[PDB]
Amino acid sequence: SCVGXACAXXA
């Protein structure tokens, strides 16, 4: 998932 740089995501 959800951002690139601290905490959300996807995989």
Next chain:
Amino acid sequence: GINLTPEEKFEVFGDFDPDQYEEEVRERWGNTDAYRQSKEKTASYTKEDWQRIQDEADELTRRFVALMDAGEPADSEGAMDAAEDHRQGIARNHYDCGYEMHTCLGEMYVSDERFTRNIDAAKPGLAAYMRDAILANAVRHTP
């Protein structure tokens, strides 16, 4: 997504410019399905929604970090719970980063030191401390 001003991003995300890496993110993996459900959800998110998560995230550090100080293991009740607390927070904040998914983030986070440096700004090794907390948490739940 965020669609915020440099000033808001500062009052919200602090000295962190995610937008600049907006399209850069997918460059890393850009192959996830969750991210699809999230974009739909983050489509209108405002500075409030974004700031709400930060003040929420800050809270996460003191307790987690505080646990480290006490010298208690990451698979500890308090630590794992903290992990389960992180899960629901990042899940209900984007779509529902399941437990298995929540884990993918744990390790893929240790790979890129950009994340770590930005994440560890609070303390070194935190990323490892959370992953295990999340990993363990997922195990007690996993059938």
